[PDB]
CSV table of C-alpha atoms and ligand atoms in Angstrom, one decimal:
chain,number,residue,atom,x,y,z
A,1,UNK,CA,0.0,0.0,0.0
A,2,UNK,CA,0.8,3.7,-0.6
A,3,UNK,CA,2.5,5.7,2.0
A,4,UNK,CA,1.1,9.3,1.8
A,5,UNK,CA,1.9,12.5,4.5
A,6,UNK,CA,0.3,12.4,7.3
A,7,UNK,CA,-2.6,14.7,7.7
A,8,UNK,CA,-2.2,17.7,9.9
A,9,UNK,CA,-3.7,20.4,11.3
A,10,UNK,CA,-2.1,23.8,12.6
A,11,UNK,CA,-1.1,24.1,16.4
A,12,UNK,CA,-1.8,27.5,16.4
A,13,UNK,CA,-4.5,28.8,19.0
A,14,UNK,CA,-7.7,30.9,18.2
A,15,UNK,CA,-6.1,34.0,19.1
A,16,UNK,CA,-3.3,33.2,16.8
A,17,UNK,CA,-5.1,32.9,13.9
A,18,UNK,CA,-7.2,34.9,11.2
A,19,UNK,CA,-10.6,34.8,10.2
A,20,UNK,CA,-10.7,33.2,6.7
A,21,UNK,CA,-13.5,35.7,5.5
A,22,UNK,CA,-12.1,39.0,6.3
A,23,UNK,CA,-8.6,40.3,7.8
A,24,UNK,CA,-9.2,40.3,11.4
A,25,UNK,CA,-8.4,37.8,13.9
A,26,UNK,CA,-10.3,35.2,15.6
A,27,UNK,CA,-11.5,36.0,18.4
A,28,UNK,CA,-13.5,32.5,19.2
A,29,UNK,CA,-15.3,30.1,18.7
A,30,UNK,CA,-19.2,29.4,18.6
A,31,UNK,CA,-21.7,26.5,17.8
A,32,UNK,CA,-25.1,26.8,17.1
A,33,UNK,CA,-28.1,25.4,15.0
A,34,UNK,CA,-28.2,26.7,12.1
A,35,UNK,CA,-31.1,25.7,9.8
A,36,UNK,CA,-32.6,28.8,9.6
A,37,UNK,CA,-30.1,30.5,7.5
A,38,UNK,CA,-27.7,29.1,4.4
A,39,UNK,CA,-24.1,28.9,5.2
A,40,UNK,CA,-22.7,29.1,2.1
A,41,UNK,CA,-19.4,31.5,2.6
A,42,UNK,CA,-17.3,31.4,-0.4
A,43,UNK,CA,-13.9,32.4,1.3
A,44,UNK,CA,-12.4,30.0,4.0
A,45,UNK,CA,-13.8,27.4,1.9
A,46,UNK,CA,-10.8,24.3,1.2
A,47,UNK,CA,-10.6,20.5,1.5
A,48,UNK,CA,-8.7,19.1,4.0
A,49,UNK,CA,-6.3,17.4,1.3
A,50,UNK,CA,-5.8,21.0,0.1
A,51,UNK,CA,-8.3,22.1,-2.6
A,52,UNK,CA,-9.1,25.7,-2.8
A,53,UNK,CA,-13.0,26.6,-3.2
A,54,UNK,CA,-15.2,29.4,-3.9
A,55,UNK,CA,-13.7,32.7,-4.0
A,56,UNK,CA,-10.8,31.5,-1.3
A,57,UNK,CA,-7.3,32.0,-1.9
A,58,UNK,CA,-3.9,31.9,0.2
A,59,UNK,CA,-3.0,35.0,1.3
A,60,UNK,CA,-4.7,37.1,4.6
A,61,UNK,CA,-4.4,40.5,2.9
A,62,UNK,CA,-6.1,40.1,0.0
A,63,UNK,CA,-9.2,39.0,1.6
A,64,UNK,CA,-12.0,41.3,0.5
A,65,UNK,CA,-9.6,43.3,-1.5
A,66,UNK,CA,-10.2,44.3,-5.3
A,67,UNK,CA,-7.4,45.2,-7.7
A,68,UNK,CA,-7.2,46.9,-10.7
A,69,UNK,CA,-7.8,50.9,-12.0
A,70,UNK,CA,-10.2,52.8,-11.7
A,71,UNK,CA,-11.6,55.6,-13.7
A,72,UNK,CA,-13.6,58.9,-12.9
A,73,UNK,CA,-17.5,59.1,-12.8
A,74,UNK,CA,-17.7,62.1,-13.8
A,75,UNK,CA,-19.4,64.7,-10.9
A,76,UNK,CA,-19.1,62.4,-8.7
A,77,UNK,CA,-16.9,61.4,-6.2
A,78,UNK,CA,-17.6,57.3,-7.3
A,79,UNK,CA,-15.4,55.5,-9.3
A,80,UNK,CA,-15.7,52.4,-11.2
A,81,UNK,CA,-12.4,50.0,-10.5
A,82,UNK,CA,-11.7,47.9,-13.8
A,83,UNK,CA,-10.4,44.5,-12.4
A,84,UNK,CA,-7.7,42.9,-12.8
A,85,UNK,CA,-6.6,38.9,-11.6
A,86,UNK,CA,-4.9,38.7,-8.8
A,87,UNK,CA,-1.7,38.8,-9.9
A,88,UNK,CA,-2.9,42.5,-11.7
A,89,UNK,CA,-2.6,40.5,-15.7
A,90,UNK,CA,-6.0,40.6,-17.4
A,91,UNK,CA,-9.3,39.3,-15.4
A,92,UNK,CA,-10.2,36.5,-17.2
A,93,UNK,CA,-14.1,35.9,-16.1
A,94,UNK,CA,-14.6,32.3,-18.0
A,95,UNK,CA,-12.7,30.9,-14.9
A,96,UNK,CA,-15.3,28.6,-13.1
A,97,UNK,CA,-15.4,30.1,-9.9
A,98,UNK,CA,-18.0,33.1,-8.6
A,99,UNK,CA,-16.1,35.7,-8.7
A,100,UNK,CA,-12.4,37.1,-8.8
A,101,UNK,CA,-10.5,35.4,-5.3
A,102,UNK,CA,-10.6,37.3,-2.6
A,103,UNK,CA,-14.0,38.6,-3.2
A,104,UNK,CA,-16.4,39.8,-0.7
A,105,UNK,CA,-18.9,36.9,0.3
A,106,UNK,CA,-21.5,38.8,2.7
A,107,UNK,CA,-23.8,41.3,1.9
A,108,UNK,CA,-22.9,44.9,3.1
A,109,UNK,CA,-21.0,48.2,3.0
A,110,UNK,CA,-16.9,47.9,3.3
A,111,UNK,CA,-15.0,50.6,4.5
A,112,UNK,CA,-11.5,50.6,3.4
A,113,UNK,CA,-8.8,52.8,1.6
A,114,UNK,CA,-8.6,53.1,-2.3
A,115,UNK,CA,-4.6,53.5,-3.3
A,116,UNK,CA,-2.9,54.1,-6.5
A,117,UNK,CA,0.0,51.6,-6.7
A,118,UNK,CA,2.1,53.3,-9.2
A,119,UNK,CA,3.5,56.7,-10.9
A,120,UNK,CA,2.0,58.6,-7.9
A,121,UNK,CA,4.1,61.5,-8.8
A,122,UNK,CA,5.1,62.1,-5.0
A,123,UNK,CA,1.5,62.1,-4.0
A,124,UNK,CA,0.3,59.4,-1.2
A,125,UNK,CA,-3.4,58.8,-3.9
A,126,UNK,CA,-4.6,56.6,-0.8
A,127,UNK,CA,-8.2,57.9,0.1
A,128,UNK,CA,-11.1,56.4,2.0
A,129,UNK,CA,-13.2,54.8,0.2
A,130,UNK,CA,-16.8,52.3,0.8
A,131,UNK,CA,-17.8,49.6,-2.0
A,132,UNK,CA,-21.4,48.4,-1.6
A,133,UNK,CA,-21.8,44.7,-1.9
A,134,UNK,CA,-25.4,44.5,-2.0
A,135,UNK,CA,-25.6,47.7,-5.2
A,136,UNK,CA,-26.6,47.0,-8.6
A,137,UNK,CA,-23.0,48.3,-9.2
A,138,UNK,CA,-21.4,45.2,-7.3
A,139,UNK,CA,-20.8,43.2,-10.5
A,140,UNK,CA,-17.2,41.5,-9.9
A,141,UNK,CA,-17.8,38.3,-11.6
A,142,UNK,CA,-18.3,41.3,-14.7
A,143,UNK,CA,-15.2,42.7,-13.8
A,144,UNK,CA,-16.1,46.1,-12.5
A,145,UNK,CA,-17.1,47.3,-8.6
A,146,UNK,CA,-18.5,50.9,-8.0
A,147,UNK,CA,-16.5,52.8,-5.0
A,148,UNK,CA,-17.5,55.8,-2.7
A,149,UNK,CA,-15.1,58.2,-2.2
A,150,UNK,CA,-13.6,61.6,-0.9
A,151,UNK,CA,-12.1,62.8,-4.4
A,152,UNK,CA,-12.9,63.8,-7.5
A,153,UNK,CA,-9.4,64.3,-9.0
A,154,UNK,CA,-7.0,62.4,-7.3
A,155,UNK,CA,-7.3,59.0,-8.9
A,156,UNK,CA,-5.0,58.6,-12.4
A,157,UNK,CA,-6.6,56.6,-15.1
A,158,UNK,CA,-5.0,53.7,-16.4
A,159,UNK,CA,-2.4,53.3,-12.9
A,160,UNK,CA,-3.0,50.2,-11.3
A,161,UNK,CA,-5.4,50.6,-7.8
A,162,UNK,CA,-6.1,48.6,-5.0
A,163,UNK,CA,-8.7,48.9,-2.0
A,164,UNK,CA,-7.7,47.6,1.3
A,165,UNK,CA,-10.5,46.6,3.8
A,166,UNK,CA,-10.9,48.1,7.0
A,167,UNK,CA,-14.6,47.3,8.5
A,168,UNK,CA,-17.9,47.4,7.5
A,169,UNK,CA,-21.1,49.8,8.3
A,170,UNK,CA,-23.3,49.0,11.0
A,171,UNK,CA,-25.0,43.9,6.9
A,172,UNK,CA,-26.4,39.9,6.3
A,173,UNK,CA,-23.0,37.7,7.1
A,174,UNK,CA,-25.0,34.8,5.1
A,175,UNK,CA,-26.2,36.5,2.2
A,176,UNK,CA,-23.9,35.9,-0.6
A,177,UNK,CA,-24.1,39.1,-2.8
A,178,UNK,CA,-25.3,38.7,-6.6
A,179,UNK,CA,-21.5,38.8,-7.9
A,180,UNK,CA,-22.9,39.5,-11.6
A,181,UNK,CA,-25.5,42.0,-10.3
A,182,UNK,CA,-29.3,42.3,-10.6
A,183,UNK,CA,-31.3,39.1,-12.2
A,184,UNK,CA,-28.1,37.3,-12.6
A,185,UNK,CA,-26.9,34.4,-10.8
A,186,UNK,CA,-24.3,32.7,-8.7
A,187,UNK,CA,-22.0,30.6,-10.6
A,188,UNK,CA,-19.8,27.8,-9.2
A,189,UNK,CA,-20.6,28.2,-5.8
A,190,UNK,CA,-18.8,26.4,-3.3
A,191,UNK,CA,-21.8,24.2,-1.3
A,192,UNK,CA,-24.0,24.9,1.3
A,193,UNK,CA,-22.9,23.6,4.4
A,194,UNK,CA,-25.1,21.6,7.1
A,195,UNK,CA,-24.9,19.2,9.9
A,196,UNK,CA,-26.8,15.8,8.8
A,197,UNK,CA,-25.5,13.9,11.8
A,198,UNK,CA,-28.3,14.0,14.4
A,199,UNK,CA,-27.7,16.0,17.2
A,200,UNK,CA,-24.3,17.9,15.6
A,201,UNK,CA,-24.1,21.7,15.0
A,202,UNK,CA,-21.4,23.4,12.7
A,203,UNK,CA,-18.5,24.3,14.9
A,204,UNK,CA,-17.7,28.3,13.8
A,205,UNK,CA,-14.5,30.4,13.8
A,206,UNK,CA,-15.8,34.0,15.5
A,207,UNK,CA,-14.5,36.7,15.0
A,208,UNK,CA,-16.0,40.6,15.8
A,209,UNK,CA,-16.6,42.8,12.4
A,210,UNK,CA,-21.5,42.2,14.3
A,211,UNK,CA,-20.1,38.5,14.1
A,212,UNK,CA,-18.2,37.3,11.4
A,213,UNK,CA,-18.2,33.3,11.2
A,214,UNK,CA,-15.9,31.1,9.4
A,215,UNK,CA,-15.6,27.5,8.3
A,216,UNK,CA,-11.8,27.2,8.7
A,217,UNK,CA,-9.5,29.7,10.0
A,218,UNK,CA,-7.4,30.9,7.0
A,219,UNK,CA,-4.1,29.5,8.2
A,220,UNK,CA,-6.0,26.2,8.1
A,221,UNK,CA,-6.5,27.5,4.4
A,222,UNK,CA,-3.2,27.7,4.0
A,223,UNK,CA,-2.0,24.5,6.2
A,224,UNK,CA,-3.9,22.1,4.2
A,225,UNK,CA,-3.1,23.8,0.4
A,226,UNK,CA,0.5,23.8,1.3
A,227,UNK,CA,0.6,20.3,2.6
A,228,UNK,CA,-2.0,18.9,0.6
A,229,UNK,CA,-2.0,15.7,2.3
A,230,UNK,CA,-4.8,13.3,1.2
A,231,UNK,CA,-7.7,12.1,2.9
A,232,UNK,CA,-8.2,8.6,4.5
A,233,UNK,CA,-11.8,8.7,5.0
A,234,UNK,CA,-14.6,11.8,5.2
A,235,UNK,CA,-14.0,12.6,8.4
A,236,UNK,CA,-11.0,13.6,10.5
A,237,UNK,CA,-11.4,13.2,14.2
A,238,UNK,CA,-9.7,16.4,15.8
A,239,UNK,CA,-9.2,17.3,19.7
A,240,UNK,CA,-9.0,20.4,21.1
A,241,UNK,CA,-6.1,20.0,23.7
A,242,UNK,CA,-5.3,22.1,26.6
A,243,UNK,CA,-1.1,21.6,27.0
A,244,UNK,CA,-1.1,23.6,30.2
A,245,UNK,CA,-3.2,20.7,31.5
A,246,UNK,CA,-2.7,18.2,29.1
A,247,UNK,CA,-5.9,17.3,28.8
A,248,UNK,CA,-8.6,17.7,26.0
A,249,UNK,CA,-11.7,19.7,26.5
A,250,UNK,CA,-13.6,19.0,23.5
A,251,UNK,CA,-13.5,16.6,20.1
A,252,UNK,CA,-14.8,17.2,16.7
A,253,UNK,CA,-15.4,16.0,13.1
A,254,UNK,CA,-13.3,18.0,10.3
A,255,UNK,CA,-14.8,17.1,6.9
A,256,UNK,CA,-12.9,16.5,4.1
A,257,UNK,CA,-15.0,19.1,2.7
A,258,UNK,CA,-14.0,21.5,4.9
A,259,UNK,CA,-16.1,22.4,7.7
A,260,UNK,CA,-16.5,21.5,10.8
A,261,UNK,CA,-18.8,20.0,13.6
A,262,UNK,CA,-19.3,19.3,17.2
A,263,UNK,CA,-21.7,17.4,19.1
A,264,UNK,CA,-24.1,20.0,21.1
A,265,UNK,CA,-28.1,21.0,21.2
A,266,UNK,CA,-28.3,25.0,21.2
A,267,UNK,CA,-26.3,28.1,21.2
A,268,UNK,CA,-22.9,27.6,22.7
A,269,UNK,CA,-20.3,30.3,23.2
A,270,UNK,CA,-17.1,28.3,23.8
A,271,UNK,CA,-15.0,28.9,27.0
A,272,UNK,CA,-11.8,28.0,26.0
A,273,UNK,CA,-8.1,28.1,27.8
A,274,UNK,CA,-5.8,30.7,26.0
A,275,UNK,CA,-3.3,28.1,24.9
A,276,UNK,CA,-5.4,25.4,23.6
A,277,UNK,CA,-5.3,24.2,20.1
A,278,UNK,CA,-6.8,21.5,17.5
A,279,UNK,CA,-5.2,18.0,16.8
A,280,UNK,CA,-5.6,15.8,14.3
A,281,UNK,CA,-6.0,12.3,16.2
A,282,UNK,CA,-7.1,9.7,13.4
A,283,UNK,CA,-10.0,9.8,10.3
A,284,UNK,CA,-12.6,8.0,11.3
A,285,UNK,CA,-15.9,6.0,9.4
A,286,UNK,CA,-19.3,7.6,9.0
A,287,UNK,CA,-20.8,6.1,12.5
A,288,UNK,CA,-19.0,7.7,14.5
A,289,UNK,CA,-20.6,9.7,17.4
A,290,UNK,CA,-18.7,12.5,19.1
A,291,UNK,CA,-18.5,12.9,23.0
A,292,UNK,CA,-20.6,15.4,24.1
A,293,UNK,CA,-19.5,19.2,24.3
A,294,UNK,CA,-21.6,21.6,26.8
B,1,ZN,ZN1,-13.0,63.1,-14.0
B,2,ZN,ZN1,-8.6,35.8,-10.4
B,3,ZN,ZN1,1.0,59.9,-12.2
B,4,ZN,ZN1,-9.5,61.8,0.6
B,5,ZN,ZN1,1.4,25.0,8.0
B,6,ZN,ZN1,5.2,20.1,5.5
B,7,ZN,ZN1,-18.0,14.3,5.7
């Protein structure tokens, strides 16, 4: 028989890691039911063997970012950012996936600063700046976004652009926005998420802007691309160990999908000691039932 790497999961704790949908970091995490709303984020979405999904990519920064250059509309303030990939060559929309990477995947107004990336001139071209992710203008998948701004004049045609995030006003963490505007629709979504095992709940990463709640911290993103280790079955049974004690204070199912789930009835906002982290223990069949949570 094969010998493949063995699958692993960062040793990092909550607080050392990032939420997967925004740049902020976690903060904690939270299980509840969740059948009343569609989890279907398209960032922090990757299988455990280390395929990206959605909208996700690699890198922390250049979550909910948009690149490219923008031009003027005229009396205004608003400019309309021509995309570009993510490396800045041309955006190529016949890639199967939603939306360029990095992509917004909530419905709401972003905060953030606009900046010209090149031939400034000696000016700083950095300027506050909101994009709208629920306007008629939020077409990405198109290749264009619509930006509120503070100038009129300061933005050079043609120079490349970026926007950075910074928060968000106030917004619907589970609505995905339409990425090719009005009386369009999604395209190559990654799935909705559930828990079919009775009397699971999805296991969330929380962080504050409002919660924001994620699948898989991004440097589990990263962790699994970067190893790519292959799965032995759809399930890998993590703990949740506490090495100041030793001991474990919670297990977990980690689907190969990526997502994951604990065994708990109701609303649950995790206590958890500061230095506690996840392990990967062993992949286990579809039978089996977790110990209880709280
Ligand atoms: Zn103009
Ligand atoms: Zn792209
Ligand atoms: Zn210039
Ligand atoms: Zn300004
Ligand atoms: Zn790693
Ligand atoms: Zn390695
Ligand atoms: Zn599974």
């Amino acid at each position: 028989e094969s010998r493949t790497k063995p699958f692993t999961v960062p040793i990092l704790t909550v607080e050392e890691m990032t939420n997967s949908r925004f740049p902020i970091p976690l903060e904690k995490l939270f299980t509840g039911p969740s059948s009343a709303f569609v989890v279907q984020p398209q960032n922090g979405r990757c299988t455990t063997d280390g395929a990206l999904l959605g909208t996700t990519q690699l890198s922390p920064v250049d979550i909910c970012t948009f690149r490219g250059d923008v031009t003027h509309i005229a009396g205004t303030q608003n400019y309309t950012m021509n995309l570009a990939s993510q490396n800045w060559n041309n955006y190529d929309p016949t890639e199967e996936i939603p939306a360029p990477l990095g992509t917004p995947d909530f419905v709401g107004k972003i905060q953030g600063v606009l900046t010209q990336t090149t031939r400034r001139d000696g000016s700083t071209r950095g300027h506050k700046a909101t994009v709208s992710t629920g306007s008629v203008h939020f077409t990405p998948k198109l290749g264009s976004v619509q930006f509120s701004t503070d100038t009129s004049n300061d933005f050079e045609t043609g120079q490349n652009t970026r926007f950075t995030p910074v928060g968000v006003v106030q917004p619907q963490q589970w609505v995905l926005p339409d990425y090719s505007g009005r009386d369009s629709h999604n395209v190559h979504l990654a799935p909705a998420v559930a828990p079919t095992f009775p009397g699971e709940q999805l296991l969330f990463f929380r962080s504050t802007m409002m919660n924001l709640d994620c699948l898989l911290p991004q440097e589990w993103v990263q962790h699994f691309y970067q190893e790519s280790a292959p799965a032995q079955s759809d399930v890998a049974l993590l703990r949740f160990v506490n090495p100041d004690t030793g001991r474990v204070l919670f297990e977990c199912k980690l689907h190969k999908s990526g997502y994951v789930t604990v065994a708990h009835t109701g609303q649950h906002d995790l206590v958890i000691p500061p230095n506690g982290y996840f392990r990967f223990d062993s992949w286990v069949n579809q039978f089996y039932t977790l110990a209880p949570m709280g």
